[PDB]
């Protein structure tokens, strides 16, 4: 007792409930209101060209079949109740490998309001592909997208919308930022349509604008390259008669420029095109090699 009334309410709700059918299957279109809270913007992987993001993924929709009358206006139920009812089959269009967290128990919540409205939040770590053009590397900025929508329900059946104003519908926790070599300038949301052979689907888009931090690349490539160039330069002040000295300087500097070139190329992915750092390295290499040619002519 003291909960038999609630047990009866829940048992009545599920009784004669078909969770294979979306709410309002024939009468109307199921309107799912979506919201994202980013508890942490994970590190960006350039080699894999992906970023990790940990979020509270909130979805809300109205289910007439779940209307109830009871002492409580909102039923805060366990996650396991969510499997017995219809929930949207949202998927991430550009998601590579996403994990639904389950410690200690599935990180999901289901809340039912007496009017039939449902709130369904889950905790996720989404790994989404973020295509990048690295022609300006390491002084480059990217808008990493997070597209999501419904699998198996077209615009005519399930549509997605932001719970609140689109500008305020994707919220990033102030302290949640696991970026090391990037800066999160802001996020932008959009809504559109995906044209598919199976139909037309609603896609909700979010773009996170990142600008790469250059301090590490400065310290590891540009300052060493400038220092190698100057080390090659100082040979001119050296004595002409010290031919072995100047030869050692030149050859060692050229070897040093090759090792910096090869070590700098491995950091970024094996893209075909040439990045800004590549041009800087090439020009520094040319300068040191010209110093060697000048010593040879002398």
């Amino acid at each position: 007792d003291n909960t038999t009334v609630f047990t009866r309410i829940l048992d009545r709700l599920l009784d004669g409930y078909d969770n294979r059918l979306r709410p309002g299957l024939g009468e109307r279109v199921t309107e799912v209101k979506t919201d994202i809270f980013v508890t942490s913007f994970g590190p960006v992987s350039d080699h894999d060209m992906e970023y990790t993001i940990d979020v509270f993924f909130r979805q809300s929709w109205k289910d007439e079949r779940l209307k109830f009358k009871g002492p409580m206006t909102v039923l805060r139920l366990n996650n396991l109740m969510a499997s017995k009812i219809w929930t949207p089959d949202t998927f991430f269009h550009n998601g590579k490998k996403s994990v639904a967290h389950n410690m200690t128990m599935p990180n999901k919540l289901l809340r039912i309001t007496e009017d039939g409205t449902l709130l369904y939040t889950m905790r996720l770590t989404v790994r989404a592909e973020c295509p990048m053009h690295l022609e300006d590397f390491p002084m480059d900025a990217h808008a990493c997208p997070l597209k999501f929508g419904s699998y198996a329900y077209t615009r005519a059946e399930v549509v997605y919308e932001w719970t609140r104003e689109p500008a305020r519908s994707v919220v990033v926790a102030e302290d949640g930022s696991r970026l090391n070599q990037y800066d999160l300038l802001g996020q932008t949301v959009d809504s559109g349509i995906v044209q598919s052979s199976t139909g037309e689907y609603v896609v909700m888009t979010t773009h996170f604008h990142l600008k790469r931090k250059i301090g590490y690349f400065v310290i590891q490539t540009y300052l060493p390259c400038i220092m190698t160039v100057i080390l090659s330069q100082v040979s001119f002040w050296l004595n002409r008669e010290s031919v072995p000295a100047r030869t050692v300087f030149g050859v060692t500097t050229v070897l040093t420029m090759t090792t910096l070139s090869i070590s700098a190329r491995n950091s970024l992915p094996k893209v075909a095109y040439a990045t800004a750092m590549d041009w800087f390295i090439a020009v520094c290499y040319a300068f040191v090699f010209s110093a060697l040619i000048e010593f040879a002519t002398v």
Epitope: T117, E161, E165, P166, A167, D190, S191, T205
Partner: antibody, heavy 117, light 106 residues
Framework: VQLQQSGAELVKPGASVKLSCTAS????????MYWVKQRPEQGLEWIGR????????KYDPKFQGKATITTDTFSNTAYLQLSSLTSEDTAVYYC???????????WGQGTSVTVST | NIVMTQSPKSMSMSVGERVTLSCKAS??????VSWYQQKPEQSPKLLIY???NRYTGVPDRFTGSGSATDFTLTIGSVQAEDLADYHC????????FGAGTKLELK
């Protein structure tokens, strides 16, 4: 499907006025309710919005205190009340409903709120 | 506060030919720009929701487009019923409307 907004009201300057927007054919709890004023032969300007299910209200930064949006879910009605009325408040006030892509799909007939002696 | 600059402020273009209304936004408002029609002494009527979507029961001569900040509304052929004030509004953030442009025939 239709918002039966109240009638035109004549208000002496400095006197508060209550404007009601009655919704039918839908539950205001479902969507947001908006209030928009249009000056005579001028562009629309958003006043504020209410989320009746939650009860939260946001305002155009220029309307803090000068306006107050409230709802009555039981009455399925939205109310706009202006604290103080001046010569600048003699406009037409509209009630609108949030739509598909956050568009104001349904608008009320409007209320003429003239401030004069 | 996104400011929607709507131009031209007025038009007297001849009936039967193309009409182009261009609405520009101060900031990014992805596709949440809507076009409302306001016939004289009457409440506005929604024409375009989102960018390039028509509302139910709207003449097919109306069509919009726009991506980030440049949005336009096009009428294939004007009619006597199209003599009305048109306003562009954004809903990406707290709503703001444009100045509205009047359409006239002559």
């Amino acid at each position: 499907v239709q918002l039966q907004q109240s009638g035109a009201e004549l208000v002496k300057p400095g006197a508060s006025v209550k404007l009601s927007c009655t919704a039918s054919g839908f539950n205001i709890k479902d969507t947001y309710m908006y209030w928009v004023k249009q000056r005579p032969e001028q562009g629309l300007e958003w006043i504020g919005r209410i989320d009746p299910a939650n009860g939260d209200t946001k305002y155009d930064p220029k309307f803090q205190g000068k306006a107050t949006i409230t709802t009555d879910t039981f009455s399925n009605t939205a109310y706009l009340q202006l604290s103080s009325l001046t010569s600048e408040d003699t406009a037409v006030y509209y009630c609108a409903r949030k739509g598909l892509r956050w568009a104001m799909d349904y608008w009320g007939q409007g209320t003429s709120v003239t401030v004069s002696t | 506060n996104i400011v929607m600059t709507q131009s031209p402020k007025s038009m007297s273009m001849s009936v039967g030919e193309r009409v182009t209304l261009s609405c520009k936004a101060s900031e990014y408002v992805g596709t949440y720009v809507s076009w409302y029609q306001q016939k004289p002494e009457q409440s506005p009527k929604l024409l375009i929701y989102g960018a390039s979507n028509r509302y139910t029961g709207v003449p097919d001569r109306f069509t919009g487009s726009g991506s980030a900040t440049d949005f336009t509304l096009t009428i294939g052929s004007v009619q006597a019923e199209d003599l009305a004030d048109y306003h562009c509004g954004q809903s990406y953030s707290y709503p703001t409307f444009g100045a509205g442009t009047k359409l006239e025939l002559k």
